[PDB]
Design a protein around this ligand. Structure first.
Ligand SMILES: [Cl-]
Ligand SMILES: [Cl-]
Ligand code: NA
Lengths: 302, 10
């Protein structure tokens, strides 16, 4: 029954994020759509598992156990936020509030993950098809049909193929791949990471140069946050930053200041991120990452 | 244009 206490905690978060003092923007990730849509897909799951055996098998499904826990954990966390923050949660620019945006981002990724792992409410994690063949092979060789793996084990296996240089690189990596922030990597999270920092063959070097050392890279930011941040640099066209698309997981969203002072965001589709950044740089659109002068040379990744 | 726009380089 732990799914019932999870809904109560979620309902509270929603009820609590409905407080119109927040002036929340209907813009993905929008918590007032995400949490009820999550309860709904959870409804859809319980209804597809319609008798006691099916409910028993579900209760033993490892991914689902981790999911419901995470979701309790995270729902508890958002409640804790509002209790500790109180007044600060009405301040657009408080850290308590940024924390809530982060959590909204986490719920959005969790929502999309459950719709990929339980499409229509039926479990198909063991048949999730990884998008890239090299990454696919790798998940296969080490984890077969698992839907979800603990970080440490993921890390140990990854390291046998693509070596991690140090502890803090491992931590920066975890933080990049563990989008749901539950200290596990699902096949879905892995699909996303391997799409973002393709090709598989040079994957950690791609991440190193596109994320770990790149000033333009923004972790856990929204569309609205990108726009507000580049607003500071609107007198310096060519200012840009990039991040994970929230509504098109596995792809990047590039935000830039145009010559006329507009903030546009664009999503590469065929072109991998590095070519998009080389192409943009050379035509004057992507010159100043996060408003800064030094723009990393990415030509070596071709 | 919408929320996300076209590649500026073409
Ligand atoms: Cl599982
Ligand atoms: Cl393209
Ligand atoms: Na995770």
């Amino acid at each position: 029954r732990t799914v019932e206490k999870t809904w109560k905690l979620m309902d509270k978060v929603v009820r609590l994020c409905q407080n119109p003092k927040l002036q929340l923007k209907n813009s993905p990730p929008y918590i007032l759509d995400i949490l009820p849509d999550t309860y709904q897909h959870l409804r859809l799951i319980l209804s597809k598992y319609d008798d006691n055996q099916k409910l028993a098998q579900l209760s033993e499904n490892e991914y689902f156990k981790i999911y419901i826990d995470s979701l309790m954990k995270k729902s508890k966390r958002a409640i804790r936020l509002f209790k500790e923050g109180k007044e600060r949660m009405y301040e657009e620019q408080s850290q308590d509030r940024r924390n809530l945006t982060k959590l909204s981002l986490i719920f959005s990724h969790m929502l999309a993950e459950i719709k990929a792992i339980f499409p229509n409410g039926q479990f198909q994690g063991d048949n999730f098809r990884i998008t890239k063949a090299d990454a696919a092979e790798f998940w296969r060789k080490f984890f077969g049909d698992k839907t979800i793996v603990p970080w440490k084990v993921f890390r140990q296996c990854l390291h046998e193929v693509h070596q991690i240089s140090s502890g803090l690189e491992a931590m920066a990596l975890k933080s990049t791949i563990d989008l749901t922030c539950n200290d596990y990597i699902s096949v879905f999270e892995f699909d996303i990471f391997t799409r973002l920092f393709q090709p598989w063959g040079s994957i950690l070097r791609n991440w190193n140069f596109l994320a770990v050392t790149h000033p333009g890279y923004m972790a856990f930011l929204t569309y609205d946050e990108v726009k507000a941040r580049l607003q500071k640099y609107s007198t310096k066209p060519g200012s840009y930053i990039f991040r994970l698309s929230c509504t098109r997981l596995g792809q990047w969203a590039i935000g830039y200041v145009t010559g006329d002072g507009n903030i546009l965001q664009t999503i590469p589709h065929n072109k991998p991120l590095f070519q998009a950044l080389i192409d943009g740089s050379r035509e004057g659109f992507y010159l100043y990452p996060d408003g800064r002068s030094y723009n990393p040379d990415l030509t070596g990744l071709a | 244009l919408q929320r996300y726009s076209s590649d500026p380089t073409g």
